[PDB]
Amino acid sequence: VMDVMNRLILAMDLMNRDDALRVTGEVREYIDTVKIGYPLVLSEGMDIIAEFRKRFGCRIIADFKVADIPETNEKICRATFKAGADAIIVHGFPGADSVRACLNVAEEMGREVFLLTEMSHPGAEMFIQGAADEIARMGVDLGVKNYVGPSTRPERLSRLREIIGQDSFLISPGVGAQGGDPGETLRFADAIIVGRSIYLADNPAAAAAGIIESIKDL
Amino acid sequence: MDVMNRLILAMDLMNRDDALRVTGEVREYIDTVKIGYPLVLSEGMDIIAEFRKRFGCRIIADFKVADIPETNEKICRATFKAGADAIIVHGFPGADSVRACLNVAEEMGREVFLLTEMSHPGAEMFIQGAADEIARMGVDLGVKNYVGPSTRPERLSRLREIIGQDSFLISPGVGAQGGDPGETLRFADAIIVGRSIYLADNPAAAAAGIIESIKDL
Ligand SMILES: O=c1ccn([C@@H]2O[C@H](COP(=O)(O)O)[C@@H](O)[C@H]2O)c(=O)[nH]1
Ligand SMILES: O=c1ccn([C@@H]2O[C@H](COP(=O)(O)O)[C@@H](O)[C@H]2O)c(=O)[nH]1
């Protein structure tokens, strides 16, 4: 599995190139893994991935929550890996064929797929939660090794961990801004994803240092 | 939304030259183009303005938005800023995530299309069993534009039943995925067609044939 420095992944969702670069560079010493999503990519272009690689020695996870039909998923994955992303996050709710398509491209292109089972926001309780256990089981049966679960619902994250086993890799968003706690989340997740709590702080570096200090024993 | 010939082109080619050429070859048959991530992540969001400059067509961004509320807002804002007239949003992530999109849409005067049931086989695993409730949620939220599967006419019909004849409904899955143009239009206001057109040796003739087959409607 990827070796995430300090078990902390930066969710760089600022939508300005200069601000995104400035902030990421300031926390550079505490993180070696950055999660880039559509807010930044649709504002600055996929070339932002290469720029982060050039400026920082950071691993890139594209949080695109792929959720299309199989054929389209393949194209999305190919475009994303061509851009230099190390891994891509895919939605499990659209079913096995859609996930398999992503795994096929990842295998062919030598990259990784992360399966998003249950989401962290309140609305996730409406339809995703009830299917999350089966989505995880589906992922396990498909050979998925990397997963995404909610920091906001410890009991759910714990169940996800059980389903995928200790060997699987698990990252979890919803820490900070959404209410999740760093330490509690790392009881089940291999690494935590943190966005606003860091990038909106007056001193992003200090915010990141503070989070790491709080989980030092972990 | 008045879609010419009730036909929406799914422009999923990933080369700017090919996408513009093919879209130009069928420009006389359509005035509505659906652009998605295959093209946008390969050529950039500036491609939307290029399409408007060269064709003037309306643009539907099929981004199947499926993030948390906060991030959905950012995605829609970025998308409408690029010139998209509408954006397709997944309903599976819940009401708050859909409302987030509706908020930005209202603020920027654009439209949100709610995707309720997908057209591929995998949609049967988790999406289908929640589809009716997702459509009802859309109605409660005041959504007026929807996306349903051409590949399952009975499901498309149920979707139409739930949203009413006043709501607008578009449907992908025509051609490549097995859906029939005419049967789909029995329930949907417009059909979405990608490969059956853009992969054809002669795209223009392909579009003309599809339109010819539905001249009655
Ligand atoms: O269930 C999920 C999956 C992914 N994210 C993503 O993780 C980040 C959380 O950011 P923040 O709340 O720390 O600012 C965002 O990029 C968001 O899109 C969630 O928050 N919830
Ligand atoms: O349930 C859905 C929702 C959207 N699309 C989209 O509609 C187009 C269908 O293209 P094609 O099968 O006509 O080539 C693609 O852009 C695809 O991503 C589907 O096929 N199924």
Side-chain angles (χ1 to χ4, degrees):
Chain A
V1 304
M2 54 172 67
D3 193 333
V4 178
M5 179 178 281
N6 287 150
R7 302 180 70 181
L8 176 62
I9 299 173
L10 172 67
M12 181 34 68
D13 297 311
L14 284 176
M15 303 166 89
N16 173 297
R17 174 176 165 289
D18 298 317
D19 293 328
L21 292 176
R22 186 188 70 258
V23 175
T24 308
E26 300 181 333
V27 300
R28 192 189 199 300
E29 61 174 345
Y30 303 108
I31 304 167
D32 72 351
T33 303
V34 179
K35 187 181 76 68
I36 289 181
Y38 284 132
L40 180 55
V41 166
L42 300 185
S43 297
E44 295 297 339
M46 286 295 272
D47 281 51
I48 197 67
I49 298 299
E51 178 155 46
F52 268 58
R53 289 293 300 180
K54 183 179 178 179
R55 295 201 50 174
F56 320 114
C58 73
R59 185 175 296 104
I60 300 292
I61 298 178
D63 189 359
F64 292 179
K65 302 177 192 60
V66 188
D68 217 309
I69 62 174
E71 181 231 358
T72 299
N73 277 12
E74 291 192 51
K75 291 184 169 62
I76 296 175
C77 287
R78 287 180 177 175
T80 300
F81 293 140
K82 177 176 182 176
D86 293 279
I88 193 175
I89 295 173
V90 178
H91 249 127
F93 79 80
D97 51 359
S98 286
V99 182
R100 186 69 237 175
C102 297
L103 300 172
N104 292 325
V105 177
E107 175 62 58
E108 173 190 302
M109 304 182 67
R111 301 300 166 71
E112 294 194 291
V113 163
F114 277 61
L115 182 67
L116 171 58
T117 61
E118 174 166 349
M119 289 181 74
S120 63
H121 65 300
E125 295 176 349
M126 295 187 72
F127 307 109
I128 295 170
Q129 191 173 77
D133 271 30
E134 200 184 328
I135 291 170
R137 195 163 71 257
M138 172 188 77
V140 172
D141 194 56
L142 290 179
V144 175
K145 296 183 297 179
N146 307 291
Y147 300 81
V148 181
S151 163
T152 53
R153 300 189 195 91
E155 67 285 1
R156 294 301 302 151
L157 185 62
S158 179
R159 183 54 191 141
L160 176 59
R161 166 56 72 187
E162 303 182 332
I163 298 169
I164 65 178
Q166 301 286 59
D167 288 4
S168 295
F169 192 59
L170 178 59
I171 61 174
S172 181
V175 181
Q178 298 177 63
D181 180 74
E184 293 290 301
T185 301
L186 290 176
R187 290 178 303 172
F188 310 113
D190 291 291
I192 52 173
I193 291 164
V194 179
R196 289 165 289 169
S197 289
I198 286 170
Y199 74 69
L200 289 180
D202 290 346
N203 187 338
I211 293 169
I212 294 173
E213 185 56 47
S214 70
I215 63 176
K216 191 176 184 60
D217 288 358
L218 305 184
Chain B
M1 186 187 279
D2 189 355
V3 177
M4 177 173 277
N5 291 146
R6 300 178 75 181
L7 175 67
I8 297 170
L9 173 67
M11 180 37 65
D12 298 313
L13 285 178
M14 301 161 80
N15 178 84
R16 172 176 166 289
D17 295 315
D18 294 311
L20 293 179
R21 186 183 68 267
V22 173
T23 303
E25 292 178 357
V26 302
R27 66 181 301 169
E28 68 186 301
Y29 303 114
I30 70 168
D31 70 355
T32 307
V33 178
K34 187 182 74 74
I35 296 177
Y37 286 132
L39 179 50
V40 171
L41 302 180
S42 293
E43 291 300 336
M45 287 291 270
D46 290 354
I47 192 58
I48 293 178
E50 191 62 54
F51 270 64
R52 291 184 64 162
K53 184 180 300 178
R54 294 192 60 175
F55 315 113
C57 56
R58 57 170 68 72
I59 300 294
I60 297 177
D62 188 359
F63 293 180
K64 302 174 185 63
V65 184
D67 217 305
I68 63 173
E70 166 65 44
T71 307
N72 275 11
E73 185 170 356
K74 295 186 177 178
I75 290 169
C76 294
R77 190 166 305 167
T79 300
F80 297 140
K81 287 186 176 181
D85 298 285
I87 191 172
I88 293 169
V89 180
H90 256 301
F92 210 83
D96 55 355
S97 289
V98 177
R99 176 55 64 184
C101 299
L102 290 176
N103 292 329
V104 182
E106 176 181 359
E107 204 186 76
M108 294 186 81
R110 309 299 163 78
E111 289 274 54
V112 165
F113 274 73
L114 184 63
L115 172 60
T116 62
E117 185 175 333
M118 286 178 78
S119 65
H120 64 299
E124 306 185 312
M125 293 182 77
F126 310 111
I127 296 174
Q128 189 175 79
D132 281 22
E133 196 181 334
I134 289 180
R136 289 201 302 282
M137 173 189 79
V139 174
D140 288 332
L141 293 179
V143 172
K144 54 193 174 184
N145 305 294
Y146 300 81
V147 184
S150 168
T151 52
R152 304 189 193 95
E154 84 280 28
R155 295 302 297 142
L156 185 61
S157 184
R158 182 65 189 130
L159 174 52
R160 167 61 74 189
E161 295 187 328
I162 299 176
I163 67 177
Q165 297 177 56
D166 293 56
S167 299
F168 194 63
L169 176 57
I170 63 178
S171 182
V174 176
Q177 299 178 59
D180 182 78
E183 287 299 295
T184 300
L185 293 175
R186 290 175 57 187
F187 313 111
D189 293 284
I191 55 176
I192 293 173
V193 179
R195 288 167 289 172
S196 287
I197 289 175
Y198 73 70
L199 288 182
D201 295 302
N202 184 166
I210 294 173
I211 293 171
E212 179 66 72
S213 74
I214 66 175
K215 67 82 180 302
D216 36 61
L217 273 60

